[PDB]
């Protein structure tokens, strides 16, 4: 029915952490698998931490709420999200200092919250720059998600088409510099050909078939017009059907039906236009005027997919056809080429200019191989997003946790009260990344976490982390296991401010 | 630590479950390798028996109660897509591979550590591959040789040199000058009211 | 039915599995023996209503009456009662020093054990912790006893180890244990609790109490004879009652005047009797039962001094310092198995006629304490306070060092420790750590007792110590959680007690976790 | 007796009623005050709605009981009466049923019970309207800065919070309007936020008169304008349309010629009618044309297109200009002389970072300011912004109000000494009532007290010490009005603190609290059908 | 819950293991069928009381009419 009291926070405690153990040894390249009992006796044996507790059913709340504060992760960064689950899960494991001692969370959140911003400060410190320009560098940079994958024969490849493709989009005269993958980066499949002939396009590709062939095949200068009216006959303000019966009330119907619909096309192919591109539809009668005048017949092309063609060849939105100046002309555009590659149409409005925007083509043999080569190219999107977006990575291997422990734990010392508590239990918390990453290869954890902590007091703390494959400690320098700082910053966060919220719930009341 | 209407296996017997399940698949399988092995029995439950030895058969025809043998199932039907033939060695090994590891994991060593012994062994066994096999030119006399290892896993050691010559004819007429081959140019066709060895071949094509 | 117990072929003995953690539940029952002291630390102890074998009711907060009392069953809980009992030689306080460090060692050992700490690194730590802090208790050293003989300084020293047994009374047990002990340290090199001794007698209160020299007896003198000073002491277990012979002695008696013959016989006979006693040169009796009507005119008639001691202890009290033994006979005139004394007067005090055995021509090294109370429950309770107190002082005639006290050391000392552990890599840092928090149990005990949130106590101490303000302990106040300094409040405590409590804690600690499977055995 | 229902009657339908009361208040309870902690709230679908708002709980809270129900409809009456004090009314009437249901298990008659607090109430509003406090200490004096000081102390404002607190103060007096019989309100359409990038929180400056995120364009017209006349046409000057929904259909090539030249040619009257208003600070919504851009600047008029319409919306309310849809009086064409025109004194385009501001000086009654936050980066104007806004209805509340009385339990402590005194008085079965009333106003100092982590017994204590001596003798020597701060752990006088609260509150959440449980102790009896 | 079924794992079909020797189970199938018609060998066979599917009664000695009707499975 409801809880209250104590066994709240508790419970919250223990459905948080059960589901941190679940995706405990999920992290790092040795990661181990799970095998996921299907209600028809299937088995599924994926090692993804978003994909496991995406089909887990769950009845606590809380571990809703670390589910769904993951997969709002997975949209702005598809990497790190297994981080989260665990730092926050090991931030409410420690309940000794919870109800044992009989602190109030108010006291713990302080101290968290306390904490979150001497970790922010520490990370950056800790950093090191990065020169965008050389394309060498976010190689090996990228090769963190390439690496482990049937894509490290064209390694290079995905390097050269995430890291272009996100710079076109990137639009830094805006001051902010904003970035889109998902509006401005549109992908699309193409059949045929090999994972070499993956490639770039340098415009927008819309996946209309072909209806009619009397429609251009080839232009070495387009014409692209465009408009959000439907070409049909002009209906009611209601969309009352016309239901007629006397013969010759059809003609009238008719006629209207055709010289509405044959004076609109009229406008359309004064300008002597090579494609006809409609946000709505445009029925059979439309049609006619379309093949007849030899253009290319194209509808349903969403708003923003719209406007990256007025950018493209220079185009002009008219809300009906009738108001169509002769800017509506998409002159300057490379080519307009509706061939059947690969057994499928696809439309190339490709040009010589960058619009903001653009298109990848993603060849391949089959569409098993063509599926494994787009989902290991959307996460060197999202890691040349993060690095343009805050060109700073910080050490990795679990250095840059303990790195920051050690700062917690030298600035505590100074912490006079009741927080410095659990303001450590954060720091000891951080060591749970480097203790999984140990225990997957299975070295000896105790001994090489303690070994680890000594380095970062003595030597540099920017540097000596862990080696997940080989499991002794090695050099971050040596190592170019090196992470953007956008993603541990938001890792580190949500994992404080998730921790903070389910300590903030004392009673799960039921109503509405 | 588990929410209601689930359950879950935390510590390593999660794993023994999974070592016990490829131990029972082997000894299932172990009695059907090679010619003097036995048979198993596929009873549809309609009223159709079946008889065979191909571990390919034995699997995916055969539906499997444990959920987690149904996997490997499934890799003998990826094994016979591209060679046709070791489905029924495949899990021999496969079991044998997990049991050794069990005797080293309850003294306390990592799985992730055997794995890493296994891409190690795999890279010496693979290479010392290439040393024994015998790349010689491919004669009727050898191939009759191949057919008869092949045949006789699957037959009552009579059918042998019925099926032995048709089975090599029948690929000799479809490739010359270093042709790439196609089986699907031999057509298969049944026929009753004759014995078991009235099996012969037919130069053109038969029609219903 | 397979698969049953595992790890079990041993007389069926519950052997706890790998998964069942068998050395956890040996430091459970270590743990379970603190809480039950726990509560009695410190100044503000809570009583614990105890039920003695004898379905006697008694209300104590001591630590040794706990543990004699508690029948501990558990072998793991024996060893650390073995070190409260081993505290007890070499020092007479600390006790729950033991209880309550060794759980917190034990206790906070689970969570190393937990992480994966193999239980022999665990020792070696606490064993370099163990030796660490014998060097820096000498540091903490603040005061020492000037040796001076002064009632005034030891009272003032004295009242730390009267606290935490009978509270709010320590004004006058420390003047009176002063005064007691002051009249013994000139014998130099002998002083002993053996000599102080008690004797409560039934009375107002405690402050109607005193002291006075030789060996005090409650009862007073039976006989009309104030004052002897005669040496020979005869002691006699058996009372002055009809006499049986141990031969024979069939007595056939048929008439009435038969009867009265033969008990004038029975009474010249013990006229006889009595005058043996002042023949053998000896004008001094005891008795053990009870004493007769004649028999007691006799010892009027020769001016024999008539003394009764009901309790055992008091008889075997006095055979051990005049010398006087006691005989299975009814007076047999045995001069050579008598004891020999200096004087022997009966005094009143409070209220109350008392036999004394006083040392005039002699030296005298032996005192007593008169205790008055109006409850024989409250001066037993008193009376443990007085051994605690007075062996605070037989330590103070080894090396005279005092340490601050109130959770004082405690946090100094962990602070001391936790730094040495921090700079020392390897993975004894984590069970010298833990030594330090062990230490910091002391004022949460001392803070939870006064009603005080805990982690606000070890708060402050922790920041007076990093400013270095040394000497700085719990102010025991209800309405005050803050702190003051132990050196101007006078609160110290012994140096060998907590030298000896360390080391007997931790090896206690250490000898359980070196226990990893208990096991019956037959001979 | 045979019914087709079911009856239960005796004391333990009081009790049932008391606990299912009491379960509504610890719901609500742990969420008492700017400290308070979240709750979930599981819908019958899956939602979750966290919240830590006692009002937001109980319109979502759903509990099957009578007695509860009791209170969700106490809710509504405290909601729209004041807005404020829901969570101290269900908590104080739930401690009022708990104390009574004790007392009626010592034979005291529910009457006698309803008797007393009936008139616990009456003299504790006598109490609090004799401790009141104008609305005063405006200018000249302090205790205001201190309220809105210790409510932007939470976000990262706080580090110099004198210098934030006079731009609230200043501005919060600079909005006041008389309007209805010396009423004087505050609107909660409240001064402009903008921000920059000014290098610094410091410079951010208070501006006496309102800010807009627009330029003129054209550099050829002025930036300093000094015409009373102010402009106000939402009709765009530039192509207009039948509809968005409605296309002119147009066949002949001839006649779309003449629409072209027409259209631009129309313009020329729209542009002389509009200039020969004189009207020189122009605002248009819908746009502007290039060509009509070009006629200000010969014309010198500070015409800006592309206005907002919500900051257009105050700029009309501040000149008073008459907001025109379209220029056709429905046969023709005009621009409505002396309609749309506003009145001001002065309106100059400053030099502001990276958006040239303008400002509006001296309209005709506008009683709104605006703020430019000019700091380091967005994540601190973005901070300051919530923090000024929150901030600024704290003082807001308080100088709308006629009277305030100290918060944080002064209130609920002072009449805690005094009702236990007036029971002592009256007798007659109506001692142990008011007596348990007073003891009951006790939960909200100890529930504010557990909900920031201090020892509600100590502090409840020394709250009641300090007012027990004010009692005893009205010497200065004697603490008064002492309030609980949260945050420090200890008592403050409210009165420097600014922790003031209004009068209507405390008043009607003691009569609605009361009135609640009189009408749960009535019920003795529960009959289903 | 362990222990598990020995050799049980394919649709729950009965894996005889190698203590009950699985080979025997159907030679007793087999020596059973033979029973019913080693009785009806020679001129000295034995009837059987045959009851059809119609619930026909048939009484006959022949070996292939037994096994139409016995419903051998
Ligand atoms: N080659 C490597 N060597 C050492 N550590 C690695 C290596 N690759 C990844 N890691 C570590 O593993 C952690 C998880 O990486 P990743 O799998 O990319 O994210 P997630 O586990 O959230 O999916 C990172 O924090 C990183 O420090
Ligand atoms: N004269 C023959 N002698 C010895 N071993 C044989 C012979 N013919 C086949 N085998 C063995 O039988 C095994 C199984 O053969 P086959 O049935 O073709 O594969 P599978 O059993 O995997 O389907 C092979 O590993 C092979 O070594
Ligand atoms: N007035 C006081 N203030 C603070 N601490 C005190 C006070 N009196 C006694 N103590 C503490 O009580 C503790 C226990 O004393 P005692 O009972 O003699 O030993 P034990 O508890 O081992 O039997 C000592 O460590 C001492 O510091
Ligand atoms: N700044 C403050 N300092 C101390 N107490 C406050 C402060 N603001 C509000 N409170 C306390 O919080 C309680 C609840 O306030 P509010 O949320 O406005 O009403 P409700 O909780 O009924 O909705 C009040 O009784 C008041 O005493």
Redesign the pocket.
């Known amino acids: 029915k409801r809880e209250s009291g104590r066994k709240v926070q508790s419970g919250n405690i223990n459905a948080a952490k059960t589901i941190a153990d679940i995706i405990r040894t999920c992290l790092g390249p040795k990661s181990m698998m799970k095998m996921l009992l299907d209600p028809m006796g299937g088995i599924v044996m994926t090692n993804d931490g978003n994909a496991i507790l995406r089909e887990i059913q769950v009845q606590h709340p809380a571990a809703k709420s670390m589910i769904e504060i993951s997969r709002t992760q997975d949209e702005e960064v598809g990497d790190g999200t297994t981080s989260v689950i665990i730092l926050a899960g090991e931030m409410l494991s420690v309940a000794e200092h919870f109800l044992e001692q009989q602190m109030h969370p108010t006291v713990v959140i302080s101290a968290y919250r306390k904490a979150l911003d001497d970790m922010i400060s520490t990370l950056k410190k800790i950093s090191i720059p990065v020169d965008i320009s050389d394309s060498d560098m976010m190689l090996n940079i990228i090769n963190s998600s390439i690496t482990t994958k049937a894509i490290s024969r064209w390694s290079s490849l995905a390097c050269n088409i995430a890291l272009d493709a996100v710079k076109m989009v990137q639009f830094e005269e805006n001051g902010r510099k904003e970035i889109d993958i998902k509006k401005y980066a549109r992908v699309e499949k193409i059949p045929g050909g090999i994972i070499e002939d993956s490639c770039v396009l340098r415009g927008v590709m819309i996946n209309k078939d072909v209806t009619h062939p009397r429609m251009r095949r080839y232009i070495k200068n387009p014409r692209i017009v465009l408009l959000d009216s439907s070409l049909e006959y002009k209906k009611g303000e209601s969309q009352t059907d016309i239901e007629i019966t006397r013969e010759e009330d059809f003609t009238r119907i008719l006629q209207m039906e055709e010289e509405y619909i044959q004076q609109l096309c009229e406008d359309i192919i004064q300008l002597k236009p090579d494609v006809v591109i409609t946000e709505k539809g445009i029925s059979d009668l439309a049609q006619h005027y379309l093949m007849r005048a030899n253009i290319t017949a194209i509808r349903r092309v969403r708003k923003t997919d719209n406007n990256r063609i007025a950018r493209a060849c220079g185009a002009r939105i008219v809300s009906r056809p009738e108001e169509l100046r002769e800017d509506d002309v998409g002159t300057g555009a490379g080519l307009l080429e509706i061939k059947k590659i690969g057994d499928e149409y696809f439309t190339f409005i490709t040009d010589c200019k960058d619009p903001k925007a653009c298109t990848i083509l993603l060849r391949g043999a089959s569409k098993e191989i063509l599926s494994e080569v787009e989902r290991n190219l959307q996460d060197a999107m999202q890691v040349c997003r993060n690095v343009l977006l805050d060109p700073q990575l910080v050490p990795g291997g679990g250095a840059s946790e303990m790195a920051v422990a050690h700062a917690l734990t030298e600035k505590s010392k100074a912490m006079t009260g009741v927080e410095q508590w659990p303001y450590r239990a954060v720091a000891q918390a951080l060591e749970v990344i480097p203790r999984t990453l140990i225990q997957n290869c299975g070295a000896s954890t105790i001994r090489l976490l303690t070994s680890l902590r000594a380095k970062h007091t003595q030597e540099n703390c920017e540097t000596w982390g862990v080696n997940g494959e080989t499991g002794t400690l090695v050099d971050m320098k040596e190592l170019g296991i090196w992470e953007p700082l956008a993603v541990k910053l938001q890792t580190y966060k949500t994992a404080v401010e998730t921790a903070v919220l389910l300590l903030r719930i004392d009673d799960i009341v039921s109503g509405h | 630590t588990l929410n209601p209407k689930a359950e879950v296996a935390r510590a390593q017997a999660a794993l023994a479950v999974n070592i016990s399940a490829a131990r029972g698949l082997q000894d299932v399988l172990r009695t059907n390798?090679?010619?003097k092995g036995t048979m198993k029995m596929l009873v549809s439950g309609a009223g159709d028996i079946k008889l065979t030895?191909?571990?390919n058969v034995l699997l995916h025809e055969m539906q499997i109660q444990h959920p987690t043998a149904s996997l490997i199932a499934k890799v003998a039907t990826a094994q016979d897509d591209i060679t046709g033939?070791?489905?029924?060695?495949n899990v021999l090994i496969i079991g044998e591979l997990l049991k050794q590891a069990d005797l080293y994991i309850s003294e306390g060593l990592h799985p992730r550590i055997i794995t890493e012994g296994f891409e190690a062994a795999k890279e010496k066994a693979l290479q010392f591959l290439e040393e024994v096999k015998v790349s010689r030119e491919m004669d009727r006399e050898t191939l009759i040789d191949v057919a008869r290892?092949?045949l006789?896993?699957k037959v009552h050691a009579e059918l042998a040199d019925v099926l032995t010559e048709a089975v090599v004819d029948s690929i000799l007429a479809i490739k010359k000058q270093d042709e790439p081959i196609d089986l699907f140019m031999i057509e298969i066709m049944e026929m009753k009211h004759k014995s078991e060895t009235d099996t012969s071949l037919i130069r053109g094509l038969v029609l219903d | 039915k397979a698969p049953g117990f595992a790890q079990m072929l041993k007389e069926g003995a519950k052997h706890f599995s790998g998964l069942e953690e068998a050395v956890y539940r040996n430091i459970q029952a270590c743990k379970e023996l603190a809480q039950t002291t726990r509560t009695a630390y410190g100044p503000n102890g809570m009583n614990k209503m105890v039920i003695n074998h004898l379905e006697k009711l008694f209300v104590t907060n001591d630590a040794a009456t706990i543990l004699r009392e508690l029948e501990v069953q558990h072998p793991a809980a024996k060893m650390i009662v073995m070190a409260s009992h081993m505290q007890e030689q070499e020092v007479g306080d600390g006790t729950n020093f033991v209880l309550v460090f060794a759980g917190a060692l034990l206790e906070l050992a689970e969570e190393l054990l937990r992480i994966g700490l193999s239980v022999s690194e665990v020792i070696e730590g606490y064993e370099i912790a163990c030796r660490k802090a014998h060097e820096i208790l000498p540091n903490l050293v603040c005061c020492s006893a000037k040796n001076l003989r002064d009632i005034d300084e030891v009272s003032s020293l004295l009242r730390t180890s009267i606290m935490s047994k009978q509270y709010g009374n320590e004004v006058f047990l420390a003047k009176l244990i002063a005064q007691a002990c002051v009249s013994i340290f000139p014998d130099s090199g002998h002083f002993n609790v053996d000599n102080i001794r008690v004797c409560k007698i039934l009375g107002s209160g405690i402050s109607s109490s005193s002291v006075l020299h030789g060996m005090v007896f409650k009862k007073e003198t039976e006989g009309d004879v104030t004052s002897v000073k005669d040496a020979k002491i005869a002691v006699y277990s058996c009372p002055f009652d009809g006499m049986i012979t141990e031969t024979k002695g069939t007595v056939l008696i048929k008439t009435a005047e038969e009867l009265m013959n033969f008990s004038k016989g029975e009474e010249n006979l013990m006229d006889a009797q009595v005058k043996a006693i002042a023949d053998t040169g000896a004008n001094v009796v005891v008795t053990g039962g009870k004493v007769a009507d004649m028999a007691l005119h006799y010892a009027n008639k020769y001016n024999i001094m008539l003394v009764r001691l009901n309790s055992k202890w008091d008889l075997r009290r006095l055979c051990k310092t005049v010398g006087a033994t006691a005989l299975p006979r009814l007076t047999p005139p045995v001069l050579e198995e008598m004891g020999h004394c200096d004087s022997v007067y009966l005094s009143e005090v409070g209220d109350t006629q008392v036999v004394v055995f006083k040392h005039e021509k002699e030296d005298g090294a032996i005192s007593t304490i008169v205790l008055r109370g109006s409850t024989d429950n409250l001066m037993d309770d008193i009376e443990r306070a007085v051994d605690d107190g007075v062996n605070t002082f037989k330590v103070l005639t080894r090396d005279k060092r005092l340490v601050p006290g109130g959770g004082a050391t405690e946090i100094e000392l962990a602070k001391q420790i936790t730094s040495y552990g921090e700079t020392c890599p390897g993975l004894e840092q984590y069970a010298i750590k833990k030594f330090a928090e062990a230490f910091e149990a002391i004022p949460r005990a001392l803070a939870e007792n006064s009603g005080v949130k805990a982690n606000e106590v070890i708060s402050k101490l922790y920041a007076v110590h990093q400013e270095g303000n040394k000497n700085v302990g719990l102010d025991i106040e209800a309405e005050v959680p803050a702190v003051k300094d132990m050196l101007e409040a006078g609160i110290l405590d012994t140096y060998l007690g907590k030298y000896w409590a360390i080391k007997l804690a931790t090896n206690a600690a250490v000898t359980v976790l070196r226990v990893d499977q208990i096991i019956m055995a037959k001979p | 007796l045979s019914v087709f229902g079911d009856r239960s009657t005796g004391e333990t339908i009081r009790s049932q009623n008391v606990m299912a009361a009491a379960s509504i208040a610890n719901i609500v309870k742990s969420s008492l005050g700017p400290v308070g902690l979240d709750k979930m709230l599981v819908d019958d679908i899956g939602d979750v709605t966290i919240t830590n708002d006692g009002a937001t709980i109980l319109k979502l809270l759903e509990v099957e009981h009578p007695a509860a129900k009791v209170l969700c409809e106490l809710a509504d009456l405290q909601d729209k009466e004041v807005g404020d004090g829901t969570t101290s009314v269900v908590i104080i009437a739930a401690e009022l049923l708990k104390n009574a249901d004790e007392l009626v298990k010592q034979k005291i008659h529910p009457t006698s019970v309803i008797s007393g607090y009936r008139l616990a109430c009456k003299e504790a509003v006598r109490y609090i309207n004799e401790n009141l406090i104008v609305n005063t200490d405006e200018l000249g004096r302090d205790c205001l800065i201190n309220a809105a000081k210790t409510s932007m102390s939470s976000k990262i404002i706080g580090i110099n919070g004198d210098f934030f607190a006079n731009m609230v103060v200043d501005a919060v007096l600079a909005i006041k309007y008389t309007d209805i019989r010396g009423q004087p309100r505050y609107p909660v359409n409240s001064v402009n936020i903008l921000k920059a990038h000014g290098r610094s929180q410091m410079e951010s400056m208070l501006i006496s008169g309102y800010a807009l995120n627009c330029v003129v364009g054209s550099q050829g017209m002025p930036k300093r304008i000094v015409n009373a006349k102010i402009a106000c046409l939402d009709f765009s000057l530039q192509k207009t349309k039948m509809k968005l929904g409605v296309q002119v259909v147009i066949t002949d090539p001839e006649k779309l010629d003449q629409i072209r030249q027409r259209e631009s040619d129309i313009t020329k009257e729209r542009i002389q009618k509009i200039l020969a208003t004189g009207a020189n600070v122009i605002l248009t919504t819908g746009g502007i044309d290039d060509m009509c851009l070009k006629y200000f600047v010969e014309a010198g008029a500070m015409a800006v297109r592309r206005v907002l319409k919500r900051d257009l919306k105050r700029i009309a309310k501040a000149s008073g200009a008459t907001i025109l849809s379209t220029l056709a009086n429905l046969e023709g064409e005009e621009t409505f002389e002396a309609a749309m025109l506003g009145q001001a004194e002065e309106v100059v385009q400053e030099r502001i970072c990276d958006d040239e501001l303008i400002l509006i000086k001296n309209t005709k009654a506008r009683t709104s300011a605006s703020i430019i936050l000019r700091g380091a980066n967005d994540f601190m104007c973005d901070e300051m912004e919530r923090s000024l806004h929150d901030a600024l209805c704290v003082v807001k509340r308080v100088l709308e109000s006629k009277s305030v009385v100290p918060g944080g339990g002064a209130v609920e402590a002072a009449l805690s000494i005094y009702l236990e005194n007036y029971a002592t008085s009256m007798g007659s079965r109506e001692q142990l009532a008011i007596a348990e009333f007073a003891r009951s106003l006790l939960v909200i100092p100890n529930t504010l007290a557990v909900n920031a982590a201090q020892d509600s017994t100590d502090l409840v204590a020394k709250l009641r010490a300090f007012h027990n001596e004010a009692q005893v003798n009205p010497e200065r020597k004697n603490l008064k009005w002492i309030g609980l701060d949260l945050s420090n752990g200890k008592p403050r006088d409210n009165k420097q603190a600014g922790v003031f609260e209004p009068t209507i509150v405390k008043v009607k959440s003691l009569k609605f609290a009361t009135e609640a449980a009189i009408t749960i102790l009535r019920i003795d009896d529960l009959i289903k059908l």
């Open positions: 390798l090679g010619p030895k191909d571990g033939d070791g489905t029924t060695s290892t092949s006789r896993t």
